[PDB]
């Protein structure tokens, strides 16, 4: 018999993202597990809004400005939640945006600003944290968010269909190459979730789901934390769709 | 902010193959969480141990006879549970066996053992418990143990892979059918566990079972078991209809 | 440079529910590219039917009564086979009905008779295929006609989405077993056709059937007959263990 | 009964990548089956000796300097085949490269070069592409080159899996926005195939293999031939494995 695992004490975590709607979620339900919080997101004023409740909550968390698309950026604000925290265990690389357009109207620039924050922001994050986890093989959790559109598309959404089918991929050799430094990587795949980035409900948006729900940020947030407080490395490279039947993987 | 739901309080749920291995530590767990736990196995002697583990750890639990492949067994086994305990919340259909052959050489009775065990076990107790979970749109938990079988195949393992492939369709069958009554639907899929499925079969481990592993680890009852109890106990429908791989880099779904 | 295989000139082809729909036109078309074919089918009246209509374009063919549930039915037609054009190159195992019910109505007899048509009659035609195909390392194609069902669900067809689900896992079997004997495997995934199989069941078209296809536009027969054409004539074995979605954006594989 | 189709003539196909491997023997190919080709490479010398062949065979091609990266060239290239046949009916978005080096040790720079040249090369064509064929809803097809790294991960490939993987859902969106101009998309994911790109072998190249086999130029050339030539759109949005069972999808 067994039982499920959720502390975080002791473990540093980073969240890009963390100002706002989902990656604000996980940051927050992260420093309740007992975690000390990265706070990292291109809007430091709101970054620091979430740092107040977390410490008001009774947590720990610092505030990093950090423009994912930036290297020094991404380096300097990892480099100072170790020197603040004392270490890095978890990454969550969350930060997004969206911008809609069809294939044949879709200015270049916005196709490469998209490509840039979602599959940029991951691997530069993803390989400043992971030079601090192979240390002494101590290892970590890389939590990527991706979405349903990892999985499949939808109109007029070209490059986040693509940078989401990416992050899987980027998730899987990180699977290969981390295990022997004990680290493993994740990809959630949430379905509509009603954040600020969100008849047009339930006939486009919610129309693929099996009972007409969105799904909430509590969902993702209660998924990340079961994935990063896991006891053993069983759920490395796999993505995990949450959905409410919106593409059953 | 929110936190993990771990309590099956005031839940009834029905494990079959639960006399032994992943079924076994399935049930044990969700008793320690509250559940009552139909014991449901065509070994009722190791049924029982696992009621007196259950009892003796302070949960309820009721060893059923029940030859899944049986639609008889079937619909009197979920009623004896129903009749005890007031109804079915969980179902985890997972009793299970391996016959290892070449297509070219295996015994067409083998064959539809197989299919006969994994598939028809997987409908009849799925038709039987949503005929109570649907009443007043109760709803309730439908879980199938597939394998990373389900997603890839292996040598030698044609009647199995073939039945833990159609799991995943029965699942996806069942969260579209369930959603208007309440009822969602998961396939858990691990990677090789040490069982007496495996042990019996190993006379391996590195160069066939773990090889494809990113980390050379098995699975263990325990990973299963916290899967099944983060499911079952999950607040929302948010997973109906999903397939979730437990398997150390084995397939990556 | 290079061009399309077309030719099947020396070949034997078995096609199982030859005599309607999907299964006729993979047979005639097979006929017209140089093969012989066994119409092998239930209604031995119709197979009679599909080789009238390849002996008048010029082709070579045989009507096999074959209830593919049926082990000894199976091996004796495949025997036939074999002793009247002298081998067996090509296996397609596309025998198939349709029971619309939702699970907690569907009788376990239905249930029952839909993985034995789908799933045992791959079996038993593929063990008794190979077992020629295997001899000397002669090899050959088997092709398990599946669905947009092998990889997604629809409501109320749980036996039909189970089956074909799992022959994705008997092919990928196949594919790793029959290597060593120059035997490949593929699956091929049609959406919704207009056979008798549909046409029955229309009386649904823009906002049930074709809803999920990106053009509101039905599969055909042609283009199923052509994608398995182009797979039995392929040059090499790089396609085995493959399954390939001919739906009109009806899920992307 | 039916037959295949493979007759190309009075059909213009563009092919990137067409001067090497597996772009030179799709775009002969096409050349046999009656297609005037766009021999589009960054190694114009190499692109103009695959038209040499082409014309001394009895086709029609012409080189075209193209850096994929560059949306100005791709749009100059693009505008350069219209010109010179009449329109655009078929693309091949193939031109790619290989950077191996583990996610820890990767310069971002050469991670950048990566998805510039697999994922800008795909949006910049096909924009260019389907500009031409929504006119007047003629329409066309657009082949993506992808890999079984569109589908599941190795050692020390981040950029080019994580690319690889999002050309699939590129691919998607347009399948879905193209339909109303009878456009349609495919990717091919080919195995290891012996071409300049590519115990070595057995053990780690094929090890995945049911066979032991490499996949062939002539392989994808033949599919990618039978989906040019196809006589309905029923193969839209889907991608095809051709990796000897490496990979079964
Ligand atoms: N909301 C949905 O329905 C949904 C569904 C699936 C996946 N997602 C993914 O979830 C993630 C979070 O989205 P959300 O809905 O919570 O959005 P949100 O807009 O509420 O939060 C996104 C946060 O990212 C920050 N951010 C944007 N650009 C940044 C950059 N360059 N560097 C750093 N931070 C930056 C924003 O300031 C904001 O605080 C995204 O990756 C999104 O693609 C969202
Ligand atoms: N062990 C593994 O590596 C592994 C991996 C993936 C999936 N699985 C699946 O997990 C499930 C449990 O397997 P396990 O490894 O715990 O095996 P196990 O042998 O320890 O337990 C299987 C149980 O099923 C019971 N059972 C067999 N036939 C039955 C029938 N007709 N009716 C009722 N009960 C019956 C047995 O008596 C036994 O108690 C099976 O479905 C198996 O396919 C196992
Ligand atoms: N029509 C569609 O939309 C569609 C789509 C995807 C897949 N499929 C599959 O294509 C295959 C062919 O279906 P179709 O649409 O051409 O149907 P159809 O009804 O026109 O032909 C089916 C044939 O199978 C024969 N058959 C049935 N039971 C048999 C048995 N026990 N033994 C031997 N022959 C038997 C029938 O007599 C008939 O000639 C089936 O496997 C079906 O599931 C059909
Ligand atoms: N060879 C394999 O094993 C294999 C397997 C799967 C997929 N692929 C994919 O097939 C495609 C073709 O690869 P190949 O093996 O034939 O390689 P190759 O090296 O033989 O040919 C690639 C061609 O692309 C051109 N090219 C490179 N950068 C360019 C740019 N920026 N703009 C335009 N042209 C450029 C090169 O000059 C060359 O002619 C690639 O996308 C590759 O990822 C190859």
Redesign the pocket.
């Known amino acids: 018999a067994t039982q499920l695992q959720q502390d975080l004490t002791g473990k540093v975590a980073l969240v ?9 979620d996980i940051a927050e339900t992260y420093a309740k597990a007992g975690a000390a919080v990265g706070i ?4 430091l004023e ?2 620091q809004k979430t740092v107040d409740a977390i410490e008001a909550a009774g947590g720990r968390a610092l505030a990093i400005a ?4 930036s290297e020094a950026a991404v380096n300097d604000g990892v480099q100072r939640l170790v020197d603040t925290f004392g270490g890095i265990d978890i990454l969550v690389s ?5 911008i809609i357009d069809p294939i044949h109207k879709m200015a270049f620039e916005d196709w490469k600003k998209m490509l ?3 599959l940029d ?1 991951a691997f530069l994050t993803t390989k400043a944290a992971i030079q601090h986890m192979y240390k002494d093989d101590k290892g970590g959790t890389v939590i990527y ?5 990892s999985h499949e598309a939808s109109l007029f959404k070209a490059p ?1 269909v693509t940078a ?1 089918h990416g992050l899987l991929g980027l998730c899987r050799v990180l699977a290969k190459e981390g295990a022997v430094h004990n680290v493993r990587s994740h990809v959630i ?10 008849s047009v409900v339930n006939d486009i948006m919610l129309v693929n789901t099996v009972d007409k729900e969105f ?1 909430t ?1 509590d969902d ?1 947030a209660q998924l990340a934390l079961f994935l990063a407080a896991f006891p053993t490395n069983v759920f490395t490279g796999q993505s995990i769709v949450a959905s409410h039947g919106w593409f059953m993987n």
Do not use: W
């Open positions: 890009t993202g963390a100002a706002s709607g989902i990656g604000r990292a997101d291109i809007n709101a970054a950090m423009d994912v698309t969350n930060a997004g945006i969206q840039a924050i979602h922001g968010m991706g979405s349903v559109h986040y989401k795949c949430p379905g509509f979730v009603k954040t600020p980035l969100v799904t940020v993702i």
